[PDB]
């Protein structure tokens, strides 16, 4: 799969359930107009294929402000990492290297 094909979160309950139901998770908070978030799309696709044990999803901050707020997302892209039922990390910015390091540590 790819950036284009992953689930795009639109609901809070869905978001909360996702944290509870996935052992390893990454959420890509983005904006359609943000250049840096756009730049990370190819990278995410590579990461999705590279780390099949991790669930990757995305959320449009403009479309779902409630979700973004819940994660205190002020800047994009923000990648929120979750492990064993809870959120445990953030990589803020289009840094593919930092993002992969974070994913590897899950």
């Amino acid at each position: 799969s790819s950036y284009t094909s992953i689930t795009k979160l639109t609901n809070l309950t869905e978001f909360r359930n996702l944290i509870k139901q996935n052992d390893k998770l990454v959420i890509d908070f983005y904006a359609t107009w943000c250049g840096p978030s756009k730049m990370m799309q190819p990278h995410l696709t590579k990461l999705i294929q590279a780390y099949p044990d991790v669930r990757f999803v995305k959320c449009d901050v403009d479309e779902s402000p409630d979700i973004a707020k819940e994660c205190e997302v002020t800047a994009m892209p923000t990648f929120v990492l979750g492990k064993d039922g809870q959120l445990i990390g953030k990589i803020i910015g289009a840094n593919p290297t930092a993002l992969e390091k974070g994913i590897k540590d899950l």
């Binding site: 904006a31 840096p36 994009m76």
Partner: peptide, 8 residues
């Protein structure tokens, strides 16, 4: 740059 910030 690598980030977009939003001030509301």
């Amino acid at each position: 740059t690598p980030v977009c910030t939003t001030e509301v």
